[PDB]
Ligand binder design. Structure first.
Ligand SMILES: [Zn+2]
Ligand SMILES: [Zn+2]
Ligand SMILES: [Zn+2]
Length: 178
């Protein structure tokens, strides 16, 4: 197995996947690495298994249909994985914890949002449809773009949104378009 966490790229107290060479800190993995369970399979392995069991699940889909899906176990897992893929980018640090807004010439958002809040919301089964999760994720970046206006720091929101969107299209097998 790897000797660094797949998500944050640091060593420490790591839990090793039994079915691939990846390793994780406890709370870097999503869901948090399960207490017992030998063997243990990581979220990358669990997603791969879904795909292998239903090869047709990789045919293209319409985003509108994906968003209306109820958060049954497989959709719950796909959203957990998509959230984890965002945390895998180091630029996710800017969006992880609760933000505050005090900048001359800007007003903070009506509905603040951040990655750890989405993480808790998933853990607590607060989303009933995929749409709920995707709306909160997109809100994170939209709030950032709006608040930072013309400051070049706005680009961090663009960059992390692009990682989110690319992974959304891959995980949920959204039909390719120009
Ligand atoms: Zn980690
Ligand atoms: Zn694995
Ligand atoms: Zn089948």
């Amino acid at each position: 197995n790897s000797n660094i966490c797949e998500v944050c790229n640091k060593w420490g107290r790591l839990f090793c996947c039994d079915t691939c060479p990846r390793s994780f800190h406890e709370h870097c993995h999503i869901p948090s690495v399960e207490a017992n369970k030998n063997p243990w399979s990581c979220i990358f392995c669990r997603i791969k298994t879904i795909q292998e069991r239903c090869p047709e699940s990789q045919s293209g889909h319409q985003e509108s249909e994906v968003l209306m899906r109820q958060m049954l176990p497989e959709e719950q897992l796909k959203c957990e994985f998509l959230l984890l893929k965002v945390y895998c980018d180091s630029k996710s640090c800017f969006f992880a914890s609760e933000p505050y807004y005090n900048r001359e010439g800007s007003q903070g958002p009506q509905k603040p949002m951040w990655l750890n809040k989405v993480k808790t919301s998933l853990n607590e089964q607060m989303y009933t449809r995929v749409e709920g999760f995707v709306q909160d994720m997109r809100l994170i970046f939209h709030n950032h773009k709006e608040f930072y206006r013309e400051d070049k720091f706005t680009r961090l929101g663009i960059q992390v949104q692009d990682i989110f969107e690319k992974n959304f299209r891959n995980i949920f097998a959204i039909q390719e378009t120009s």
